[PDB]
Here is the input.
Amino acid sequence: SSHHHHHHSMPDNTIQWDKDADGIVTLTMDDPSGSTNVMNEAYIESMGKAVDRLVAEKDSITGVVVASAKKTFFAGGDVKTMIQARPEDAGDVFNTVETIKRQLRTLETLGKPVVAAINGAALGGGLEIALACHHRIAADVKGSQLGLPEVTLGLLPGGGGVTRTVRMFGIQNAFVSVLAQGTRFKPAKAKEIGLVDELVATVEELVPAAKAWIKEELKANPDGAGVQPWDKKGYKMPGGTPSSPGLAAILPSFPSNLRKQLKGAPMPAPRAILAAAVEGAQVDFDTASRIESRYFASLVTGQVAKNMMQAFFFDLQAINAGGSRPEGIGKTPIKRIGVLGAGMMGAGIAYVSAKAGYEVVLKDVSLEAAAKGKGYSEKLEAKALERGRTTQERSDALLARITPTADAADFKGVDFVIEAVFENQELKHKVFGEIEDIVEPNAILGSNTSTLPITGLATGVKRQEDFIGIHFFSPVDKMPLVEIIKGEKTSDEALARVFDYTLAIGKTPIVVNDSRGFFTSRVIGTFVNEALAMLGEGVEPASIEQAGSQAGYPAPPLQLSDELNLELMHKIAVATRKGVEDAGGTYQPHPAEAVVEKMIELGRSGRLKGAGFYEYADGKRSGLWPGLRETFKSGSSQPPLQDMIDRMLFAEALETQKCLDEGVLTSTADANIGSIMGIGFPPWTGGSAQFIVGYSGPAGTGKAAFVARARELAAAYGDRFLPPESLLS
Amino acid sequence: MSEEAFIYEAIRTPRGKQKNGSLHEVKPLSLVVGLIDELRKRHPDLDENLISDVILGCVSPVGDQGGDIARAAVLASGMPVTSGGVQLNRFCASGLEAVNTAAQKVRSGWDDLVLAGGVESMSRVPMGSDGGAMGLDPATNYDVMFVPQSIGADLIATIEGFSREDVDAYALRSQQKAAEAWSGGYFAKSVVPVRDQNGLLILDHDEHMRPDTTKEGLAKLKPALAALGGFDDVALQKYHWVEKINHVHTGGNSSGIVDGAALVMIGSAAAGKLQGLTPRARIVATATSGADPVIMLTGPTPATRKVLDRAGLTVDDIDLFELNEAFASVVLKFQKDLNIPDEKLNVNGGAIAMGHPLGATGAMILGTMVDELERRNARRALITLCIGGGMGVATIIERV
Amino acid sequence: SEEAFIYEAIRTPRGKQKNGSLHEVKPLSLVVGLIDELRKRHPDLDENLISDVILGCVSPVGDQGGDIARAAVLASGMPVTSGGVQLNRFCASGLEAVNTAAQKVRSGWDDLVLAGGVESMSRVPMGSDGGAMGLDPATNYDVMFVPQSIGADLIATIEGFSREDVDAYALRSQQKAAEAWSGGYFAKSVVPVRDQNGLLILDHDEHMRPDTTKEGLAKLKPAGGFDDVALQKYHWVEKINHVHTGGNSSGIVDGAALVMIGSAAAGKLQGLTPRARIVATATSGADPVIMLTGPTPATRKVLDRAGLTVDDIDLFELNEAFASVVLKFQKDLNIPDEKLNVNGGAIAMGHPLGATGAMILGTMVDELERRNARRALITLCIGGGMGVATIIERV
Ligand SMILES: Oc1ccc(/C=C/c2cc(O)cc(O)c2)cc1
Ligand SMILES: Oc1ccc(/C=C/c2cc(O)cc(O)c2)cc1
Here is the structure.
């Protein structure tokens, strides 16, 4: 009933009040605790006082304008509080969002027009505040975004975002376009879909245009002023209600289509958003709003939300704030970049380097190949012209900064080298020797390497202080991680220069110490080897792929092994066996190595050869190889699917704990984001390190339950699942 | 577990097709009242006050089939108002569950003479008109892994190894045996032609039958709610060892969408002797079980095996097997698992040729076996129907 | 042959129609919550032995369509062999499910059966499914369709029940229902409804107006030409005295109920204690223009079938659809006043159609054990001229 948190020192005040001579109240949100208005305890009390005052002075008020004094309008909430919400705190969480929506609902049913003056970003609770208004005006300014992206953190729009968007667009359009993926929209895109009604060139026109809309609405439509479409007698939900014959014919396919998109992964947020949407569309607006609160409380008190809030909020903040960057280093921009090699990696590094505004030289062995390296950018620009993302004026500037060549003299005047020819040490030593002198004197000498140690590669150049590993991922235009590998001779200044270069091209960096396999390749190796071991043990290939998909991976493991080429995996096993039998120890071969060699003997080494675990025709996977079941007697071993799923997740999680023990990684933020954005570790886990402390199974939850399940897998599948002493008491 | 239940009458209407059907203009209540009037014509001196209940199966009890269509049948047909009237929905085997419940009510000794059957006018009330939790509850739909019938049948044919030619071979087999049964006059006295309020003929045959069906014409049909994506992925997320689902089922090897109704008069020996009724068959045993709800259609196998064990019989003791022809792969799997002799399985064709009036099919194929046990002078027959959600229902009858 | 026993009988609280606490709760969730309570009381119950789940539902459309009994079996994770069937016999669907479950156990072809009903009238109002008797002019014009409320007013007119007489019974139902709640009679059977987080939604029958007074009942007003239609058959009556209001008629509420019924060997195999024994069941009726008259010939039918009379019954539980129906029933069989609906009825707590039969059935199971009494007769006036009756015996 009350607009406040409690019925029985007090919080701050974040809303300024102003009533003009016309009776228009302008609520200007300006939280003095930070540079962004968030939905915390201070806002709830502030809006509670203001909404009370709107009702008390309702005789002398003709309209309301909700504005902001920050660079953004209103973005997000209090993650430090939501990540602490225990299951026993479901009552407080439920009551908080019910209070938040009780305020907006009174603001919405005031009998007076309410206009939102969106000056900048309106994300999460911010857009929900605007959705409670009757008219939304956005300033078409750079960097502004509007959306409900709480699903990306494992939450749902619990401040009316689910209920109102469904009231505006119907179940199907609100879920698919706005809610299910938390899509962000530029102000121009927002007006097109219906999230925003008007646009203005600058932010100074917002409050004037808002009060102008109030005056015209009061005179033109005096009856329906301050009345939402779903509060009129003859409201008709777009696309129909769940009882409409047209929608009831496609409604049973919505959960199956979502279960198809998620591949059976245990991500509960999209499942809850769909339930709250459909259940909400069956009842009145207030009953729908309360159902929205209960599904929100079930997510915040859950574990997946804490995994995602830890990874995509806290862990991402620490990385982007220079957590792994050396503390006291200055910044030095780079003029031109030199990409050695025009393969799928070299051509990819050329595109992302130019799209950020950097001149690039693309040197290859022959000019015939260097041209088709720049064609990787042409085919991605033509795909951006027909789809209409970039204009013609902008596209010409991108391809112009790429100068494809085969001459080694064009690297004259390059202060950033990114080699990517092939995984061969004597080749890189020769390639770097041909270029280390023509380039600048203080140039960064980076190398896109997957396994060869950077310290060894540095013995082929002169200035090793500026030699470093800069590991990209294919395709470079999509993969957001850059694995910065710190060689033994690399200086702290080189780390920062590559660190800031990673942020300049719009990617997320991690700092990794030199070690065989680094972090991404070494951990993802345990993932594919666990599946190959399962195949050799006689497990159905279709179950192995389904196990990888239902675990949350973006690509099934046997499919990934074909794209990584089994010859390279055999090559790595020979190198690993070489560093053990020479150091004086006996090599313990992984059980997957027997399956790699068998596929090599059968001439099916991967997608490169045209035949692997899958068959290929017309340059596309044509299905699983029929002879695969006969080769390994598939079906003779039928372990439960959860045992297959856990064997992959635990192999990567345990291997990540080893990397944190050996010093390969210096923070769990690098372990989580690096595993998620680098090798595609499932986001619902929050990272390969978060997966340990946030594990949840039938035995229990937490690190103690992770060890118990690891020992359960070790006693039934091999000693490789035994947890290190770092996780034991 | 004392009073024996006996079948005294078992009739049905002809099954009118969905598109341009002859029964589309007939309210489903009229289909039942017509059968009630036929029972009066055959037994004019039957004291209808001894009828204690009328149980009708109906899968879509909405619109013309809402408001307890069994009660509407009792009131509209002028039956004694003390004759009850109840609608039950157990999906596909609602027609046989109504018969089984009537038989069990007689066995308990607390009901004496019961009308049982079903009604389903799918041309007027399409399947799904009643809605359902699975559908309007994405939380339930997402958890139970809901999969339509047609996908579960394709999955059965994929696992068991039934080719597209195998299912079309059975589809032709059903059309041939259904045509031979009509030409032989087998259905002459049990299929009651539907007439209007003036006595003019509306339908006197199962107009869904394509008796000139050929193997070549069945191969040209293309495989068929299920068109909406996701259901293949949802099915293979549970049956993860299966890589691809071979969609072999078309409109020519699947049960036909038709309208129809059926009535079965069930009562004790004392009730039949008091009304001068000759017992036709005896309800030996009934059973109810099921199987996985993502494959759905499988499930008759535990029901058949339990009703055989309950009656102390084996497969060899049964003379006729009547399984609803929802999909060809379901019958082929049922025949393969139990080693059913081909000359004893659906000897007069099935739903592929004559149609599947959901709520009425169970009583239609039951009365079909009562007539065929007499015409052959055979002893026992077993009737079973698959159900969505995996919950089969089986029944054994014995000629008397 | 086999005797059927009642091992458990629970129900949800009945949430009112306007601003109801259960309006946000899907009727499927109401049944699942009761299934989970049965698991809580018998966690080692072999659910594979449960052969069927029979739910009564008068408006099986929307949230209640698609065989809601089957949906409860799947959503609650019960074995898929446990069946699931919806049945509709108007106001008796709750008790018909229990009776059918008992008859399936007696026949020996079912061992352990769940029975009950569910009706979320705030989400699915009655009549949402349509029907022929209403939406078919040919059969409507013939059977003389009259709403059940007018039949109740006609009963009060013929039997001489005044507006004060029906309101006197309404106050009596409110008093006894409030006395039963405060006395803790419903403590074990009424299972509070909670959300997916465990937060409370409803733990009591909120339709009850315990501070009811006879003066307040008199201030109520009595709630298409159906009066002329009814008198065309009951031609000796000149005018119908409309005495029924919202205070002396059954409340429109949401609720669900479950009853576990099985053979003596079934309970002994699963470590269950029989609470009561189903003694006999019966079904009959009378004129459907007055509708709610089936209980009287059905009660005599179940008394003769069990070899009993009125003096052999300790408790009479008739559903309080309308006050005149209970008064008409009380006068006919000369029911002692202290034996009839001793814990209040639907006038106070509500009438969730498809579930009411199982609710008042479990209500008598508790009151027989609380009083250490022997027998009880339960009957509901079915709509459309039918009646069910059941006699239970305490064990
Ligand atoms: O990779 C990422 C994934 C998710 C996010 C979260 C974005 C976000 C921002 C808000 O103002 C509110 C909110 O609820 C969510 C950020 C990065
Ligand atoms: O879109 C939205 C996303 C999240 C929220 C929740 C905010 C919140 C703020 C608190 O101080 C406590 C709490 O438990 C929750 C509101 C809207």
The CA atoms of residues 311 and 690 of chain A lie 8 Å apart. The longest strand of chain A covers residues 24-29.
